[PDB]
Amino acid sequence: SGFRKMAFPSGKVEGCMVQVTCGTTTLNGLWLDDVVYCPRHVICTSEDMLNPNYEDLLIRKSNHNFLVQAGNVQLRVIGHSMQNCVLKLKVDTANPKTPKYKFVRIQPGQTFSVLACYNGSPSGVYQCAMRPNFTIKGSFLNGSAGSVGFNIDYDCVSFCYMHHMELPTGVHAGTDLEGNFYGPFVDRQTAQAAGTDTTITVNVLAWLYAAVINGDRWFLNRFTTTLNDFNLVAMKYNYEPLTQDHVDILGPLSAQTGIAVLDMCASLKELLQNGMNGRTILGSALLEDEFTPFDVVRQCSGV
């Protein structure tokens, strides 16, 4: 038993991480087969970053302006192109450590592992959720751009996030691996703000089920609510409404614990109205929303 914020093993991703340098600007790239993917602002100097015209900046670059290092080996760039907010650098060598992989786009509420990297070298791994306002609450310093987020399924790495920048509130923003931003943000150093965030309700319920599977039962009660009566409380407490698909996704956990989804919703309602009364759930004094139903099943059962 036990329940922890748990990342996927990072080995398959570590072997893809490279360093990309343009002038004095450096960040991380993702080397898959003979292409290195990285955030396009590597072609910015410091003075370029407030109002870059990336088309202009890139046309003035040639292949030899891109220094790509895989460990100590320098990879020769033989072609380059811009796709949205990422650069694709064709290199003369295919990564012999390329895993089976997919590029995927995730939706708010889903989770992924981040391999934080600096100078092409992996530094650490942690778990993240994409917030309803499309930001992520990561841990990123200067040099971390190009670090990637990912999920692993049966030795296939699904890359879902590439890191670009930090908003003034201290949260983080990035793109999918085709360079499309998550959220209404652009890659320049301007005043930008995310939309008002909300709490991921289905994830809170999934984590309450994890707590029950692990023997925390003190928040359970005899009541059951309706999907509509609950959503009224949800909107009052800045929680996302619960959908029927959410109720259906919670099916395996409801059946495992024998606690109906709407039975659990009455626990959540009580916790939102009255708090925890000095008690904790799975070691937390706050309601946790960065575990999906899949995360709970993966960890509380099997592997």
Binding site: H41, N142, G143, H164, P168, Q189
Partner: peptide, 10 residues
């Protein structure tokens, strides 16, 4: 306050 692009400096 402004966004910080998080490339590094060499």
């Amino acid at each position: 306050a402004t966004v910080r692009l998080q490339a590094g400096n060499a």
